[PDB]
């Protein structure tokens, strides 16, 4: 007795607690990150960020704006968050621009606040066409400004040309030397290019990236 309208009372109650939910998630999601964003752990240490977590999403329009460019470098922002020593990238959008750009990080922000979904400003993209992931000396003074200015923030580079070729970095604060040597993983170079890379190759290095799918993201 009763019976089917208490089926229906129960779906309604698990949708109306769902709703609560995501809510709650994104309130609470929100106020720690507000939170890290006021104790800012790495103003102190220079080698605070380690790990970068790239959504498959980001990650496929990042590939297909890069591949749109051709021999051309193309650029653009990223969205996400930080998580301790690890940066997130949820998100991103091609570009083109100063309001232009600010307008759509806006947007993002907005349309990912309706699914319940916390993300900000956290990097830009750019791509070295057929040449590797690294910063040139452009970027190395850029990324310096962005560690200044746009902070917590992270540079992204893609080589679409050639396996999955994408660095995440983190420049050095001017003045600062970091301890012994670094050369990681093996990249070939042109020769054309190979002074810029070593003139400023010490200045930044390279957070652990990896890769992960997101539900929202399974579209
Ligand atoms: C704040 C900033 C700092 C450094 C760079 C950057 N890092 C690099 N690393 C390797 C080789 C080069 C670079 C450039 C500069 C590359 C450029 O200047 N261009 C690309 C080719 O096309 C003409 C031109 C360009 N300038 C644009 C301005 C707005 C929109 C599209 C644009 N393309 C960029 C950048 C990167 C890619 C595209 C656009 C801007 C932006
Ligand atoms: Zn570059």
Same mark, same amino acid.
């Given at each position: 007795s009763g019976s089917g309208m208490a089926q229906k009372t129960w779906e309604l109650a698990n949708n109306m607690q769902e709703?609560?939910?995501?809510?709650?998630?994104?309130?609470?999601?929100?106020?720690?990150?507000?939170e890290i964003l006021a104790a800012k752990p790495w103003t102190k240490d220079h080698h605070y960020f380690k790990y970068c977590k790239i959504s498959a999403l980001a990650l496929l329009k990042m590939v297909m704006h890069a591949? #749109?460019?051709?021999? /051309?470098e193309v650029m653009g922002l990223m969205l996400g968050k930080v998580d301790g020593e690890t940066m997130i990238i949820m998100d991103s959008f091609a570009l083109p621009a100063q309001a232009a750009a600010y307008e759509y990080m806006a947007a993002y922000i907005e349309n990912a606040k309706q699914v319940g979904r916390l993300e900000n400003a956290i990097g830009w993209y750019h791509s070295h066409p057929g040449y590797g992931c690294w910063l040139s000396?452009?970027?190395? #003074?850029?990324?310096? /400004?962005?560690?200044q200015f746009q902070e917590p923030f992270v540079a992204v580079v893609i080589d679409?040309?050639?396996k999955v070729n994408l660095g995440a970095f983190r420049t050095y604060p001017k003045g600062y030397?970091?301890?012994?040597?670094?050369?990681?993983?093996?990249?070939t170079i042109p020769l054309n290019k190979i002074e810029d890379f070593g003139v400023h190759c010490k200045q930044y290095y390279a957070l652990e990236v990896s890769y992960f799918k997101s539900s929202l993201d399974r579209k």
């Open positions: 709703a609560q939910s995501i809510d709650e998630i994104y309130k609470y999601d929100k106020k720690q990150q507000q591949r #749109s460019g051709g021999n /051309l000396g452009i970027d190395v #003074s850029t990324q310096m /400004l962005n560690q679409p040309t050639r030397k970091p301890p012994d040597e670094g050369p990681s993983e093996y990249q």
